[PDB]
Scaffold this active site. Sequence first.
Site, mmCIF file in Angstrom:
data_model
loop_
_atom_site.group_PDB
_atom_site.id
_atom_site.type_symbol
_atom_site.label_atom_id
_atom_site.label_comp_id
_atom_site.label_asym_id
_atom_site.label_seq_id
_atom_site.Cartn_x
_atom_site.Cartn_y
_atom_site.Cartn_z
ATOM 1 N N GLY A 1 -24.778 -49.246 -8.165
ATOM 2 C CA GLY A 1 -24.125 -48.430 -7.432
ATOM 3 C C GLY A 1 -23.420 -46.891 -8.195
ATOM 4 N N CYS B 1 -25.530 -45.215 -10.205
ATOM 5 C CA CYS B 1 -26.382 -44.204 -10.242
ATOM 6 C C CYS B 1 -25.981 -42.862 -9.463
ATOM 7 C CB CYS B 1 -27.714 -44.496 -9.537
ATOM 8 S SG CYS B 1 -28.764 -45.946 -10.404
ATOM 9 N N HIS C 1 -34.082 -41.903 -6.234
ATOM 10 C CA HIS C 1 -34.397 -43.392 -5.831
ATOM 11 C C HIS C 1 -33.297 -43.501 -4.790
ATOM 12 C CE1 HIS C 1 -31.642 -44.568 -9.395
ATOM 13 N NE2 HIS C 1 -30.894 -45.086 -8.241
HETATM 14 C C1 LIG Z 1 -36.015 -47.686 -11.516
HETATM 15 C C2 LIG Z 1 -34.725 -48.233 -10.595
HETATM 16 C C3 LIG Z 1 -33.536 -47.339 -10.543
HETATM 17 C C4 LIG Z 1 -32.529 -47.766 -10.122
HETATM 18 C C5 LIG Z 1 -32.473 -49.189 -9.911
HETATM 19 C C6 LIG Z 1 -30.882 -49.707 -9.728
HETATM 20 C C7 LIG Z 1 -30.419 -49.810 -10.967
HETATM 21 O O1 LIG Z 1 -30.881 -49.613 -12.068
HETATM 22 N N1 LIG Z 1 -29.139 -49.685 -11.197
HETATM 23 C C8 LIG Z 1 -28.124 -49.853 -12.248
HETATM 24 C C9 LIG Z 1 -27.874 -48.716 -12.895
HETATM 25 N N2 LIG Z 1 -26.858 -49.015 -13.922
HETATM 26 C C10 LIG Z 1 -26.571 -50.066 -14.208
HETATM 27 C C11 LIG Z 1 -26.893 -51.154 -13.356
HETATM 28 C C12 LIG Z 1 -27.736 -51.207 -12.282
HETATM 29 C C13 LIG Z 1 -27.991 -52.240 -11.748
HETATM 30 C C14 LIG Z 1 -33.346 -49.850 -9.855
HETATM 31 C C15 LIG Z 1 -34.585 -49.397 -10.227
#
Ligand SMILES: Cc1ccc(CC(=O)Nc2cnccc2C)cc1
Lengths: 304, 304
Positions: free
Chosen positions: A143, A145, A41
Amino acid sequence: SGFRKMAFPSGKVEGCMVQVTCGTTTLNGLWLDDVVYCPRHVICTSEDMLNPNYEDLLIRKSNHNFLVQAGNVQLRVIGHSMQNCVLKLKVDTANPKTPKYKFVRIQPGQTFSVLACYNGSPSGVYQCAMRPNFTIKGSFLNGSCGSVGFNIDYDCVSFCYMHHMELPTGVHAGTDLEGNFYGPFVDRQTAQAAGTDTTITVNVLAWLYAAVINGDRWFLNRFTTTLNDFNLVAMKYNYEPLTQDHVDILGPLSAQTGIAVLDMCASLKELLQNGMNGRTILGSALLEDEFTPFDVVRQCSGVT
Amino acid sequence: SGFRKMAFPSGKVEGCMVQVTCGTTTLNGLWLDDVVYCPRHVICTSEDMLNPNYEDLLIRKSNHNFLVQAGNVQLRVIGHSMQNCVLKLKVDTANPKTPKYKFVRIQPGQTFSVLACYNGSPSGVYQCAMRPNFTIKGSFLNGSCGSVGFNIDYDCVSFCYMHHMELPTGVHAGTDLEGNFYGPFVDRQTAQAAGTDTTITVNVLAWLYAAVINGDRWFLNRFTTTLNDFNLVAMKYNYEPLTQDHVDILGPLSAQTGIAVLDMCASLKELLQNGMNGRTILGSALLEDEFTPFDVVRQCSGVT
Ligand SMILES: Cc1ccc(CC(=O)Nc2cnccc2C)cc1
Ligand SMILES: Cc1ccc(CC(=O)Nc2cnccc2C)cc1
């Protein structure tokens, strides 16, 4: 003595963290040998996230669009490919800090350490379990990820998790290092059911053995039970059914303490039916399931 | 989102761990620049431990008696000296992995990460608090002495603790990096009173703010209190009295959540007087005091 939620030393993993940027998106990558692994992503924008067509989004990208920085130094990207939900960016330099490593897919109920990272820089390390429903209850912000989960076997790092997303319920989902999600999750901004979770019974029993080893013994009783009787109680309290395979892995702890596994099951049965009555076990007021029998033995023996 | 008992990444400290052996005793040392720091009890035998005369025991030792091994390689010891309860072994080689570092003496109620080590090899990392009574509730076994506690400020490691001993009660005692014990403890095998401990009120409040930030809000109520009224409750429940200095350090969390510090005190007052009624806060069934207001802000912002 003492018993803590201990993580593996994170040094070998810190040396693999890099920052990966594609367009406006930045996340973490794992640099092992001459490949950088990161969540696919990284190639999405906000508009793309309801249902991204990853194949089409990746086709619009070239090696030069993936900016990889190892702390201060820039890596030259000479290949890119998508494998399931991860991208593999081939770089022209092997990471000089690559530890001996393996990619493993862990089982639900197993534990691992997470090195939370932002912009390729390590923020902190914590220990957690893969829930029976394949989610993790981590501590991650936007951030994070690309941060990874792992276990260490002397000099070998077994990478088992890469962080991908936060579910609307505030729990976390990710993949093994081949990009396969744990559980039913997909990398889309869609509400997604995480199955019914259960408590990891074998881990609670391992933790009751850790408590006895460290002197917390008040919960030991004059009773015994059978697997069948214990499993009727486990059923009622949403605990995983205990099998002979679980009794067998508790063998070392049973031998060390002299407390038969079914006698410890009778202590756990009484705690489930009566609660703690305002008492604590290893500083906790609830039944802890984030330590496996291996973790308890390792912590109680001093494995480096 | 999510909130975990997160430790600092241990890599910079792993690179400083060495094994120190003197006669039959082996423990861990910390190699920074050209000095190795370790507990002075490395020079004792079992007979010596009731009341060791460290000055006399050290006089019987020469530089060549201190065997220091950095993983696989042997260090050449060119000087030795005792400072309070630590020995400083001057070596002929500066540690190439020495991070930017400081020696700090932490205050009771402050938190730090511990890298538990055995035979100079890191076993695991966990986060803990220095209790108001100057003990730590760690996870340490025989051979863990010389393991250190620390905090990291971007690239700087502030070493605050070196492990020395386990009290007969199973709690831990140690020194700052100049060898001064925290608390009334002495490095003798003698039963030693650790003072009356208290719960770190400012940390419990910081953790209630972390709970609100992550969605656990059930404990918020329609009440307020005053510092005087709150302190009568803190007194009854063996909590540290809250001061304006504690209210001031909670300012950032109060601003972020919009919940006035005294209103959060009224939530804490009700939890103390009523208990949790079988509910949980951030996965805990008790009031957690091992997160400072700085820790909560750091974890909730993503500091690397
Ligand atoms: C399907 C998809 C994948 C990634 C994102 C960003 C996301 O979720 N980041 C995140 C990860 N862990 C904790 C807090 C956050 C905000 C959005 C949509
Ligand atoms: C005064 C003194 C100092 C050190 C020792 C050994 C000791 O306490 N080691 C230890 C430390 N932490 C956890 C478990 C253990 C056994 C004996 C006497």
